[PDB]
Structures are given as structure tokens and as C-alpha cells.
Amino acid sequence: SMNPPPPETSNPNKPKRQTNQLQYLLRVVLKTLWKHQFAWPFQQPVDAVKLNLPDYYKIIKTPMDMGTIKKRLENNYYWNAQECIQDFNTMFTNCYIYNKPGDDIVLMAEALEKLFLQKINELPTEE
Ligand SMILES: CCn1cnc2c1c(=O)[nH]c(=O)n2Cc1ccccc1
Numbered sequence: 001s002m003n004p005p006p007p008e009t010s011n012p013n014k015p016k017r018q019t020n021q022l023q024y025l026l027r028v029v030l031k032t033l034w035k036h037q038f039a040w041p042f043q044q045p046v047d048a049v050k051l052n053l054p055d056y057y058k059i060i061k062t063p064m065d066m067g068t069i070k071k072r073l074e075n076n077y078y079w080n081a082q083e084c085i086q087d088f089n090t091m092f093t094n095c096y097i098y099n100k101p102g103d104d105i106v107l108m109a110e111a112l113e114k115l116f117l118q119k120i121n122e123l124p125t126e127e
Pocket residue numbers: 041042046051094095098099104105
């Protein structure tokens with residue numbers, strides 16, 4: 001029932017890049033999802049205490065959320081786009097595993113995911 005430490009968002013010894021695909025992930029993908037009306041549950045790590053989800057971290061071993069991804073993008077955490085695309089996919093998967101089909105949180109994730117898949121379809125060519 002306690003919250004774990006958050007996912008890592010700073011590591012000076014992790015090598016990094018700034019790249020046109022990573023810039024697209026921030027300016028197009030993250031921004032598009034973040035401004036959506038259903039973003040709010042996904043904008044920060046799950047607070048299992050606040051939300052009364054005492055089993056959440058027993059089930060979900062690789063937590064991920066858009067607050068973390070926004071910090072990873074803004075803090076230049078990544079080496080490549082794959083890593084950031086994987087974070088989005090982990091966030092959606094976690095929601096589909098934890099919750100019941102058709103629960104409001106699930107519909108919310110499916111709506112975000114639709115937009116995510118469209119933007120990823122459109123990923124720019126690597127410069
Ligand atoms: C996506 C992470 N997350 C944030 N809040 C959540 C969840 C979750 O997986 N399951 C949940 O039950 N809630 C609570 C919640 C349900 C419905 C709408 C809003 C918040």
C-alpha cells in the first residue's frame with residue numbers, strides 16, 4: 001500500500017542525445033497527449049495512497065506515467081526515440097493490465113493511445 005520511489009528521471013552517467021526524433025516526441029507526441037481532456041490521471045506517478053489502490057505496486061513492477069516521460073524528455077534523459085516510445089507503451093500496458101476492460105481509466109488510455117499511434121506512424125526520418 002506505500003508508494004515506491006519514482007522511476008529514474010536524472011542520471012548524469014547515462015549517455016544522452018538531442019535528436020530530431022526525440023524533439024518530435026516532446027513537441028508532438030507528449031504535447032498532444034498532455035493537453036487532451038483525459039490526460040489528468042496519466043500526468044504523474046500513481047499515488048496509491050491518495051487513490052486507494054493498495055495493491056497497485058504489487059501488480060505493476062515497471063510503473064510509468066506521462067509526468068515521468070515529460071521529465072525524461074525535458075531533462076534530456078534519453079539516447080533514442082525507442083526508449084521513449086517504450087515508456088508510453090509501458091504506461092498504456094500497465095493501465096490495461098491493472099484495470100477492468102471498459103473501466104473509465106481504460107477508455108481514457110485507449111483514447112490517448114489512439115493519438116499516440118497516429119503520431120508514431122508519422123515519426124520523422126532520423127536526420
Ligand atoms: C493510469 C494510472 N492511474 C491513475 N489513476 C488511476 C490509474 C489506474 O490505473 N487505475 C485507477 O483506478 N486509477 C484511478 C482513476 C480511475 C478513473 C479515472 C481516473 C482515475
